[PDB]
Amino acid sequence: EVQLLQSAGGLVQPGGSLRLSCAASGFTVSANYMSWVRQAPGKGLEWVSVIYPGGSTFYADSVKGRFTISRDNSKNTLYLQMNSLRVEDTAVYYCARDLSVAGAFDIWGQGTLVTVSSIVLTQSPGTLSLSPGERATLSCRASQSVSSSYLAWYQQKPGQAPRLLIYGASSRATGIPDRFSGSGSGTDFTLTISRLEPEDFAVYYCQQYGSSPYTFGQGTKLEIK
Amino acid sequence: FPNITNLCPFGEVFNATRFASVYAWNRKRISNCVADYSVLYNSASFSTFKCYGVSPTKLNDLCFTNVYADSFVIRGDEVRQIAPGQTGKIADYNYKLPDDFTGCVIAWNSNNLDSKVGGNYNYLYRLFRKSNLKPFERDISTEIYQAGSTPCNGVEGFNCYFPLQSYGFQPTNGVGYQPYRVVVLSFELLHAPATVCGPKK
Ligand SMILES: *[C@@H]1O[C@H](CO)[C@@H](O)[C@H](O)[C@H]1NC(C)=O
């Protein structure tokens, strides 16, 4: 029963100082990769920071220097200090462990919301409103044509945290039903859901890793005609 | 010095046949011979001859006590992490450069010589460790890195993961996904009388 709890639901004054918190529930933070990602509501997800075992820090390309992530083994925490914050920085700040090669972001946190004052990866199909009883196709193309197994898929849920469906586009994660399939190579990948169930109508994202800062898809939502 | 002691085996380092992967980096000490470096800067096949230390022109006027050649097969744009002080997935749990790595670093270009239509699965690289490696050190012990607090007696499962992952190489564009070959020539400063000077008169 791995759990990742967060507590950052507080409004911030202009140029204010905040401190987020991600805990652990059984796995030591000193032996596994950790990552902070931004949900960016109204658009696709994006990357913020990565901490390796050891304690070398990697930050995103858009932001340089100002972000300050810190690791505390004494209290088993993955703190992130938000310094003076500017406009258009309101989003969710998910945190998750990283096993990029073998399982990408298997478990996530819960989420939060921070307010303000007062590789080219694209995914083709779109909404594709359908009905239960058949299959569907979702296509995720890339501009760099990552070779074999550096792309994964995620599933959102209204109000919940993102989940893992398939890692490396070859094998699904544990607990995933056998109704999810994936294939493709070279430039684009295809994913298919067979025998649509009511607990399946959710937004699907395709993410790339093992390269320059990680990028997610814009977002494919499924709806009933 | 006499007329010629012997030709250095240094050419074999550049143009051998079988190379070791990054997890098990191989070394070769160059014994007493007359230094042959004039054939390096004159070759057009080299494109990453950037190195900090002595001048890249007064190579024949050097008398370093002992020289080592280290070889590994790190791939693509991951090469640039080899520098006087860096951190990353390669220079954290693998080949690490100190601030006194006097010498040079050389990169190659990959082709069909080191590739397979089916693919390459005999190349491994460290991905999980617990601390940063000291300079010029290796850690070869691969059972479990113990991500979680649960016992990891040798059963594959949750919180007990393998620390080695195989490279995946396929014929692609090749900008950053080809089996590049990187060697490092490392010099010493003073522990014994100099033996590898390269004058002739
Ligand atoms: C290897 O290649 C180099 C340069 O391409 C060449 O000078 C040399 O003769 C070749 N053979 C050996 C045994 O080094």
Total strand count of chain B, please? 6
Note the main sheet of chain B.
4 strands, antiparallel
Overall body shape of chain B: globular
Spatial order of strands in the largest sheet of chain B: 1-2-6-3
Oligomeric state of shown chains: heterodimer
CATH architecture of the domain at 121-221 in chain A: Sandwich
Main β sheet profile of chain A: 5 strands, antiparallel
**What would the principal axes of the Cα set say about the shape of chain A?**
globular
* Spatial gap, N to C terminus of chain A: 38 Å
From the alpha-carbon coordinates, what is the Rg of chain A to the nearest angstrom? 18 Å
Radius of gyration of chain B: 19 Å
PDB class: viral protein
Keywords: Spike, single chain fragment, viral protein
Assembly: dimeric
Entry title: SARS-CoV-2 Spike RBD in complex with the single chain fragment scFv76 (Focused Refinement)
What's this, in brief?
The complex is a heterodimer of chains A (about 220) and B (about 200). Chain A has no helices and 16 strands.
